[PDB]
Every structure is written in structure tokens, then in C-alpha cells.
Design a protein around this ligand. Structure first.
Ligand SMILES: C[n+]1cn([C@@H]2O[C@H](COP(=O)(O)OP(=O)(O)OP(=O)(O)OC[C@H]3O[C@@H](n4cnc5c(N)ncnc54)[C@H](O)[C@@H]3O)[C@@H](O)[C@H]2O)c2nc(N)[nH]c(=O)c21
Ligand SMILES: C[n+]1cn([C@@H]2O[C@H](COP(=O)(O)OP(=O)(O)OP(=O)(O)O)[C@@H](O)[C@H]2O)c2nc(N)[nH]c(=O)c21
Ligand SMILES: C[S@@+](CC[C@H](N)C(=O)[O-])C[C@H]1O[C@@H](n2cnc3c(N)ncnc32)[C@H](O)[C@@H]1O
Ligand SMILES: Nc1ncnc2[nH]cnc12
Ligand SMILES: Nc1ncnc2[nH]cnc12
Ligand SMILES: [Cl-]
Ligand SMILES: [Cl-]
Ligand SMILES: [Cl-]
Ligand SMILES: [Cl-]
Ligand SMILES: [Cl-]
Ligand SMILES: [Cl-]
Ligand SMILES: [Cl-]
Ligand SMILES: [Cl-]
Ligand SMILES: [Cl-]
Ligand SMILES: [Cl-]
Ligand SMILES: [Cl-]
Ligand SMILES: [Cl-]
Ligand SMILES: [Cl-]
Ligand SMILES: [Cl-]
Ligand SMILES: [Zn+2]
Ligand SMILES: [Zn+2]
Lengths: 299, 123
């Protein structure tokens, strides 16, 4: 019925981002309801398809030999539905690396098994996707405070391994969130909290940072912004919808051939920031991509 | 390797074993990742992107590979997988068992269609 039902999902409106709410308990009227998915389609294939359909509407940088890393790519199924959708979406030849605490079979070019903190690389990335979630987050015994764990790693990975012009999509929920990650969203040309229409009944959202600028463009208080996110979800019921899954004609990410340049931090002027902010520039070397997984040696 | 490969050839016969498993009423391998697609593709067997036609379903390749799913070495040279990182088109009538279909069928090296399910080079 709602017009947003034909969209892949709903982004947090700007006026909700400008509030100064106190954190409330999340209470969705349709909480737990399951979407009606096309025959034989997995929930995570539908979820990643809607996330990619939404990323298609942003100013993403899409260089030749694009580099994408996907954290939390495994599943209790032992397969990687999200990685299969990203590889379908990304231009052919895109280097796709995925990772998970648990072993799984993947379509990625390379897969690293182990805690995300064991993943190393001197290379910079054009796009970071995280679907990580700590199962213990379900154990709500205290006040809903900012979480560390893998979020500390993701914040450092963005600050040290994301190319200027690059983008991120990090999964959060009412209880799975980090204040420093929201603050980092202020270091991008644009940002939002995106809710897939197939998971409208969940507090889940993808925090999207569009075009990394390597410096703060706006100051964001993470504690206030998560409260603003929950207030938005609590007062704006979203109808479950799988409508956007039926039209895949324009699904593939447009190969923009975005320019890739190597610039010193002292060469990042307003003219360069303008190019980064439009998805027309990626700043990083174009050396071979090398990744490693730390192995703890014990008796 | 001689005595190790001699044994593997005898006992490790996944293709035959899975075929016998289904004959004994074994439930087909599940969680093959079916992709959303237009269903107006070329219809070739294994492709870089989903190419299912109106009579096919496209799946993530690694999830339809018996060797990947069972974590056993691949028979292909240098353990090279033909499905991992690709999309496999499965006839809708056989989409209930993609692993079984990829095992029991072979691709035509000329048109890229499944032999007996799209390949018409013998006309
Ligand atoms: C939003 N919300 C949260 N809770 C309560 O708070 C707890 C923690 O809340 P959460 O931060 O996990 O958020 P939510 O419940 O919305 O998450 P959901 O279960 O939809 O999971 C979202 C995604 O997280 C991942 N995930 C969830 N559980 C796991 C898990 N065990 N292992 C791995 N990934 C998981 C999956 O990708 C999944 O799709 C819930 O388990 C529930 O008791 C609610 N209770 C009511 N009555 N109404 C609500 O609206 C509500
Ligand atoms: C989606 N998006 C929004 N903005 C900023 O937000 C402004 C308004 O863009 P908007 O999408 O928020 O509003 P609009 O009314 O155009 O569309 P709707 O909200 O979907 O109905 C832009 O002019 C940019 O300043 C964006 N800025 C950048 N750099 N990249 C983006 O992808 C992007
Ligand atoms: C919701 S599941 C991911 C589902 C997957 N994206 C898909 O396509 O179906 C969340 C995953 O996060 C992983 N995870 C949680 N904490 C992690 C950590 N610290 N390091 C690595 N992986 C982690 C879990 O092992 C789990 O597989
Ligand atoms: N009725 C409708 N309103 C808005 N967007 C749409 N997309 C398809 N049908 C639509
Ligand atoms: N609500 C909050 N809880 C903990 N630390 C904070 N710092 C700022 N706001 C905070
Ligand atoms: Cl608004
Ligand atoms: Cl369903
Ligand atoms: Cl049915
Ligand atoms: Cl494991
Ligand atoms: Cl590994
Ligand atoms: Cl405490
Ligand atoms: Cl924590
Ligand atoms: Cl921790
Ligand atoms: Cl509604
Ligand atoms: Cl200047
Ligand atoms: Cl442009
Ligand atoms: Cl192809
Ligand atoms: Cl192998
Ligand atoms: Cl059927
Ligand atoms: Zn394989
Ligand atoms: Zn042929």
C-alpha cells in the first residue's frame, strides 16, 4: 500500500538525524513478522539484493579493478548468500574478499576464516560490507550501551584501510551498534541508516558511509544518533515488502571507471574533496592486493 | 601419492556415491544459493553472472559444488573448481537438487550449454 513498498527499503530521513533523542527501547508493531519471499529465495539473498539496489542510487566510486571486502559473510548454512549477491552486483573482475569467524564455502576470490581482528592487509579498499553480529547481543541484561568487539576493528579498518572516495555498509541493530561508528559516518560526503523492505520487521539497518573524505565534514554524537535511529524506527512502521526483488533488469552496479590516483594528505584540497563527494575519484596506490589471517600457535 | 591416489580413486568416488545416496532415498544437499535474476539470460551452464533463461534457475556456483560443500579435494587439475566464483544455470525441473544435476551432467565446450539441456550442436 505505502509508496516506499516498491523501493528496496527506507533510509533514515534527514529531520530524524537532526533530533537529540534519548535512547528508548525499540518496539516495532510488526516485530518478528517474516516477508513473503519469491519461491526458493533465501532471506539473505533478498536482503543483500535490496541493499545493492539501494547502493545503486548513491554516488559510489566504481574504479577498474575495484576492491571489495565482506565481513560476516558466513552463515549457519555453511554457504555465503550475501557474497553470491555482491559478486552478481559488482563489475566482472572486481576483487572480492570475504571473511567469517566460522568456516563456510564462498564465491569470493579469497576467504579468510577467524575473528575479524586476525585479518590484516597493507592495501586500501573501495567498499567495505559488514554483516557481523555477536550472538551474545541477544543476552540483553544491562542498559543498551555502545558495543565494542568487532565494531572496534571495523572503525580502525575504515580509518586505516578505506580509500578516500570509498564507501561502507555496516549492519547494526537496536543492541548491535557502536557510537564511534556513527561518529565516523560524519567523515563521509553523505551517510544514512538503510532498512531493507524484506526485513522491515527487524531493528536491523545498514549504516552507509558514502564517499570517505578522511576528515570530519560534520560532528556526529554516536549515542544521540543511535537514539535518533531508534526513535525513527519506533514512530515509522515499515510494511514488509519483496516487490523490488521482481525487477532485476538494472541490478548490476554501473561500471563508472572512476579515476584512481595516489595523493599525499597535503594534496587533498577542496577541488579533490568535490570529486571524492561525487563518486568520481578513489585515492590509493594500485599495488597487488595481499591479505593475511593471524594464526595463534599453541600446544 | 601413488598409494594415496590409488586408494582415493577406489573409495573417494563422490559422483557415484552421491548418485547411490539419492538411490537409497537420501535427502538432496540443501542451501544451494538461488539468485534473483531476469530469467532472460543466455541459458549457458556456468557463467560469470546469472544467465538463467525462462526454463532455468541461477545459483551461486560454490554452493552447488559437491567438492566445495563436502570439503573434499576436486578431481579437476590442480584441484581447480569449475563452479566457485561463477553462476550455474539449473533447469527449473531439476532445481530441487543442483549438486546432483552438476554431477550427473557435463557442459558442451562449443556452445557452453548443458548437454541434453540446451546444447543443440548435433543438428
Ligand atoms: C527491536 N527489538 C528487539 N527486541 C528484543 O531485544 C533483543 C535484541 O535485539 P537486537 O539488537 O538483536 O535486534 P532485533 O531483535 O531487531 O534483531 P533480529 O533478531 O531481527 O536480527 C537482525 C539480524 O541480526 C542477525 N542475527 C540475529 N540473531 C543472530 C544470531 N543469533 N547469530 C547471528 N546473527 C544473528 C541476522 O542477520 C538477523 O537478520 C531481541 O532478541 C528481543 O528480545 C524486541 N522485542 C520486542 N518485543 N520488540 C521489538 O521491536 C524488539
Ligand atoms: C543520496 N545522496 C544524498 N546526498 C545529499 O543529499 C542531497 C539530497 O539528496 P536526497 O536523496 O537526500 O534527497 P532528494 O530529495 O534528492 O531525494 P529523496 O530523498 O530520495 O526523495 C544531495 O543533493 C546531496 O547533498 C548525497 N550526497 C552524496 N555525495 N552522495 C549520495 O549518494 C547522496
Ligand atoms: C547474520 S550472520 C552473517 C550472514 C551472511 N552475511 C549471509 O550472507 O547469510 C553474522 C555472522 O557474523 C559472524 N561474526 C560475528 N562476530 C564476528 C567476529 N568478531 N569476527 C568475524 N565474524 C564474526 C558470525 O560468525 C556470523 O556468521
Ligand atoms: N505505484 C507506484 N508508486 C511509486 N513507485 C512505483 N513503482 C512501481 N509502482 C509504483
Ligand atoms: N549516553 C551515553 N552513555 C555513555 N557514554 C556517553 N557519552 C556520551 N553520551 C553517553
Ligand atoms: Cl526529513
Ligand atoms: Cl517466504
Ligand atoms: Cl512451493
Ligand atoms: Cl569453523
Ligand atoms: Cl582462513
Ligand atoms: Cl554494569
Ligand atoms: Cl562489547
Ligand atoms: Cl571486546
Ligand atoms: Cl505502515
Ligand atoms: Cl583549497
Ligand atoms: Cl558522474
Ligand atoms: Cl559468462
Ligand atoms: Cl581442491
Ligand atoms: Cl517445483
Ligand atoms: Zn568446488
Ligand atoms: Zn553444444
Amino acid at each position: 500500500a505505502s509508496s516506499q513498498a516498491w523501493q528496496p527499503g527506507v533510509a533514515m530521513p534527514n529531520l530524524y538525524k537532526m533530533q537529540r533523542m534519548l535512547l528508548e527501547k525499540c518496539d516495532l508493531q510488526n516485530y518478528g513478522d517474516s516477508a513473503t519471499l519469491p519461491k526458493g529465495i533465501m532471506m539473505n539473498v533478498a536482503k543483500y539484493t535490496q541493499l545493492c539496489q539501494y547502493l545503486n542510487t548513491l554516488t559510489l566510486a566504481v574504479p577498474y579493478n575495484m576492491r571489495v571486502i565482506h565481513f560476516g559473510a558466513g552463515s549457519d548454512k555453511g554457504v555465503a548468500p550475501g557474497t553470491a549477491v555482491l559478486r552478481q552486483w559488482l563489475p566482472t573482475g572486481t576483487l572480492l574478499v570475504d571473511s567469517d569467524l566460522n568456516d563456510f564455502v564462498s564465491d569470493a576470490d579469497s576467504t579468510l576464516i577467524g575473528d575479524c581482528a586476525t585479518v590484516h592487509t597493507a592495501n586500501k579498499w573501495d567498499l567495505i560490507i559488514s554483516d557481523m553480529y555477536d550472538p551474545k547481543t541477544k543476552n540483553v541484561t544491562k542498559e543498551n550501551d555502545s558495543k565494542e568487539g568487532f565494531f572496534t576493528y571495523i572503525c580502525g579498518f575504515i580509518q586505516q584501510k578505506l580509500a578516500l572516495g570509498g564507501s561502507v555498509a555496516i549492519k547494526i541493530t537496536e543492541h548491535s551498534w557502536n557510537a564511534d561508528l556513527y561518529k565516523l559516518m560524519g567523515h563521509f560526503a553523505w551517510w544514512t541508516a538503510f532498512v531493507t523492505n524484506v526485513n522491515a520487521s527487524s531493528s536491523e539497518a545498514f549504516l552507509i558511509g558514502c564517499n570517505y573524505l578522511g576528515k570530519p565534514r560534520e560532528q556526529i554524537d554516536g549515542y544521540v544518533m543511535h537514539a535518533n535511529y531508534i526513535f525513527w524506527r519506533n514512530t515509522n512502521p515499515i510494511q514488509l515488502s519483496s516487490y523490488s526483488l521482481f525487477d532485476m533488469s538494472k541490478f548490476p552496479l554501473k561500471l563508472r571507471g572512476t579515476a584512481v590516483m595516489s595523493l599525499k594528505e597535503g594534496q587533498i584540497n577542496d577541488m579533490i574533496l568535490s570529486l571524492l563527494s561525487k563518486g568520481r575519484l578513489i585515492i590509493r596506490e594500485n599495488n597487488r592486493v595481499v591479505i593475511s589471517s593471524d594464526v595463534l600457535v599453541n600446544n | 601419492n601413488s598409494t594415496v591416489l590409488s586408494f582415493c580413486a577406489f573409495a573417494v568416488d563422490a559422483a557415484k556415491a552421491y548418485k547411490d545416496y539419492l538411490a537409497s532415498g537420501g535427502q538432496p544437499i540443501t542451501n544451494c544459493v538461488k539468485m534473483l535474476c531476469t530469467h532472460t539470460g543466455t541459458g549457458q551452464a556456468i557463467t560469470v553472472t546469472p544467465e538463467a533463461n525462462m526454463d532455468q534457475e541461477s545459483f551461486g556456483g560454490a554452493s552447488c559444488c559437491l567438492y566445495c560443500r563436502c570439503h573434499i579435494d576436486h578431481p579437476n587439475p590442480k584441484g581447480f573448481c569449475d563452479l566457485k566464483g561463477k553462476y550455474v544455470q539449473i533447469p527449473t525441473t531439476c532445481a530441487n537438487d543442483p549438486v546432483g544435476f552438476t554431477l550427473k551432467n557435463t557442459v558442451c565446450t562449443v556452445c557452453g550449454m548443458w548437454k541434453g539441456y540446451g546444447c543443440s550442436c548435433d543438428q
